[PDB]
Amino acid sequence: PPHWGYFGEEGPQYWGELAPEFSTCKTGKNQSPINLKPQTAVGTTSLPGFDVYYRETALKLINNGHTLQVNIPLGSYIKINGHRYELLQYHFHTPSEHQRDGFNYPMEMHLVHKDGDGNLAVIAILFQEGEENETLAKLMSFLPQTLKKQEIHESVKIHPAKFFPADKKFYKYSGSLTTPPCSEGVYWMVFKQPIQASVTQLEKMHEYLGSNARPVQRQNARTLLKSWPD
């Protein structure tokens, strides 16, 4: 499996050309992220919402070269209309990958879920500058200084739903992974409301991660849904 990254010949424009297994990055018509345009988004009257069943667990953390990833032990899940997906992990992007009207946010966060058949559901949370984020602060104390370590902290418990915004409105669309092999068939939900982190918090995250965001992909035939009515 070839090396890929966010700059140069390895960068996002060349992903689809790096190896046969990566080709969807270039040939897919339902890719993520997308530019989110609220004016263009379609209101709904019965879009399924989701129920969160996350349990408190020791912090397992890794800088895998492409992102900072928190690995979740089996036992946490969501239910989208009674359909159950297991929380596998969450990780971070600086700057954000999704845009609002063509503008990036300073940071984006992805909570990755999978069901029994291999189906993926992702919850995306956007950050903007503002109040210090206490939940983020717990995490940042333990940023790994080593690449590709797994770094366990038994006594640190962070509930991932602490990162959820107060407003529960979200956008939903059918998309893909934003990293190779860019697999499609991903159920995306993106919270409308960004949460806040401090400027110095956002800066340290960016300094740590570098720029690890994929450029926005064409919406094509897809409809962007709102979870509330117009």
* Residue 191 near which of a second copy, Zn ion, none (CB within 5-8 Å, type-dependent): none
- Min. distance of Cβ 39 from Zn ion in angstroms? 26
Tell me, residue by residue from 151 to 180, as one string, x for binding to Zn ion by CB under 5 A and - for no binding.
Answer: ---------------------------x--
16 interacts with a second copy by CB under 8 A: no
192 interacts with Zn ion by CB under 5 A: no
Q: Is 205 helix (H, G, I), strand (E, B) or coil?
A: helix
The C-alpha atoms of residue 39 and residue 209 are separated, in whole angstroms, by 32
Q: Which of residues 57-116 bind a second copy (CB under 8 A)?
A: none
Please count the residues of this chain forming the interface with Zn ion, following the rule CB under 5 A: 2
Q: How would you class 220 by CB atoms within 10 Å of its CB: exposed for 0-12, middle for 13-18, buried for 19 or more?
A: exposed
The C-alpha atoms of residue 187 and residue 40 are separated, in whole angstroms, by 19
Q: Is 22 helix (H, G, I), strand (E, B) or coil?
A: helix
Closest to a second copy by CB, 1 or 229: 229
Closest by CA position to 77, among listed 160, 155, 135? 160
- Min. distance of Cβ 175 from a second copy in angstroms? 7
The C-alpha atoms of residue 31 and residue 215 are separated, in whole angstroms, by 10
Interacting residue with Zn ion among 4, 69, 98, 110 (CB under 5 A): 110
| Residues contacting residue 24 through CB under 8 Å, at least 6 positions apart | 16, 31, 176, 181, 182, 183, 184
220 interacts with a second copy by CB under 8 A: yes
Q: Is 137 helix (H, G, I), strand (E, B) or coil?
A: helix
- What token pair was written down for 221? 């035939």
Closest to a second copy by CB, 10 or 184: 184
Interacting residue with a second copy among 15, 92, 187, 191 (CB under 8 A): 187
Q: Can you give the binding site for a second copy, defined by CB under 8 A?
A: 24, 27-30, 42-48, 119-121, 172, 174-175, 183-188, 220-223, 225, 229-230
